[PDB]
Amino acid sequence: IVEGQDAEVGLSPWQVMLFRKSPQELLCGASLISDRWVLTAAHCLLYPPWDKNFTVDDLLVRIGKHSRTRYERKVEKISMLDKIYIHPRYNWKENLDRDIALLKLKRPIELSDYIHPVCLPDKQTAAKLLHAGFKGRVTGWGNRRETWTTSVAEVQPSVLQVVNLPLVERPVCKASTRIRITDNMFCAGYKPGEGKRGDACEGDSGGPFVMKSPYNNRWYQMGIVSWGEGCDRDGKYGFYTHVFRLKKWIQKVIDRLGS
Amino acid sequence: TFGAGEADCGLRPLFEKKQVQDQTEKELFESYIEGR
Numbered sequence: 001i002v003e004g005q006d007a008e009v010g011l012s013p014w015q016v017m018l019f020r021k022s023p024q025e026l027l028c029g030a031s032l033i034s035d036r037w038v039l040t041a042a043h044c045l046l047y048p049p050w051d052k053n054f055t056v057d058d059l060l061v062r063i064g065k066h067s068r069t070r071y072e073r074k075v076e077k078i079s080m081l082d083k084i085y086i087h088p089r090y091n092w093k094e095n096l097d098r099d100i101a102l103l104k105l106k107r108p109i110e111l112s113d114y115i116h117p118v119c120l121p122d123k124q125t126a127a128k129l130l131h132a133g134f135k136g137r138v139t140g141w142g143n144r145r146e147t148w149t150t151s152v153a154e155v156q157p158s159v160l161q162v163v164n165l166p167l168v169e170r171p172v173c174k175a176s177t178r179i180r181i182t183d184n185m186f187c188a189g190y191k192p193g194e195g196k197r198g199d200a201c202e203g204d205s206g207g208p209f210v211m212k213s214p215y216n217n218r219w220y221q222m223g224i225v226s227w228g229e230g231c232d233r234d235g236k237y238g239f240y241t242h243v244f245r246l247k248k249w250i251q252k253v254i255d256r257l258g259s
Numbered sequence: 260t261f262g263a264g265e266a267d268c269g270l271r272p273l274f275e276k277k278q279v280q281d282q283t284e285k286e287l288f289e290s291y292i293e294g295r
């Protein structure tokens with residue numbers, strides 16, 4: 001998270017780390033949307049340009065963490081995925097359209113003071129909260145600046161990072177990029193003149209962009225961290241899987257059919 | 260999973276349930292009454 005800050009403890013209790021099993025590395029973020037189900041980005045599992053095509057025993061998931069590094073004994077769950085559901089009209093050969101994936105946990109999680117689901121948006125919360133200039137909340141463990149790498153890229157926070165970042169209006173998301181935008185994605189970030197900064201970066205992808213509804217005091221996940229040209233460049237914005245529109249798919253696969 | 264609210268969902272045990280606010284929520288509520 002670029003220009004973010006360390007999160008208080010219990011801040012996104014829905015935050016999930018997507019790790020490779022052996023040898024261990026953090027690959028992506030994801031969120032807990034119930035004691036069985038994790039939403040993350042599709043690019044996290046399958047990116048064919050890069051031969052990435054991860055299966056259920058390449059992968060584990062950690063829940064309830066705050067520090068990136070060391071095992072928080074009392075509070076964290078490692079778990080293995082039972083299944084992996086990637087959208088069929090997911091498009092890796094262009095613009096990462098319909099970039100969403102659902103992961104079925106092996107067994108139910110015991111919910112906790114540090115582990116708790118986030119809600120998916122209804123129609124009305126999408127209608128009331130998705131306006132240009134309204135801010136939502138990205139969190140994650142990824143790099144704090146753009147990098148290449150040396151023997152490691154150096155850029156790894158000890159503790160979970162937060163940034164709050166305003167929704168941006170579509171003809172400016174549009175014109176930020178030569179990439180084809182589709183209604184499945186939105187962008188967010190500060191504009192060159194606004195002189196606040198911040199952005200997801202690598203390793204934050206797959207994670208939640210959440211907004212709090214004042215109406216009921218709940219947090220809703222409106223976005224999944226999808227793609228960027230680099231991290232926090234100016235004149236440039238982060239893009240984000242529009243969860244609500246792909247609510248047709250989500251409820252599909254969870255109820256088997258379901259859409 | 261449920262849309263709209265799995266009862267306690269998006270109500271964090273350490274924050275809303277203890278009616279404490281986190282260090283950055285007011286920035287968002289700010290952004291709300293900067294718009295509609």
Ligand SMILES: C[C@@H]1CCN(C(=O)[C@H](CCCNC(N)=[NH2+])NS(=O)(=O)c2cccc3c2NC[C@H](C)C3)[C@@H](C(=O)O)C1
Nearest residue numbers: 043047095199200201202205226227228229230231238
């Ligand atoms: C394969 C995945 C695709 C998404 N990613 C990215 O988009 C990275 C990271 C940007 C982080 N900043 C941000 N989110 N604002 N930007 S990227 O390095 O320019 C790039 C790498 C490979 C594919 C693509 C990219 N650009 C957007 C394009 C539609 C898909 C990479 C990631 O690991 O996050 C690689």
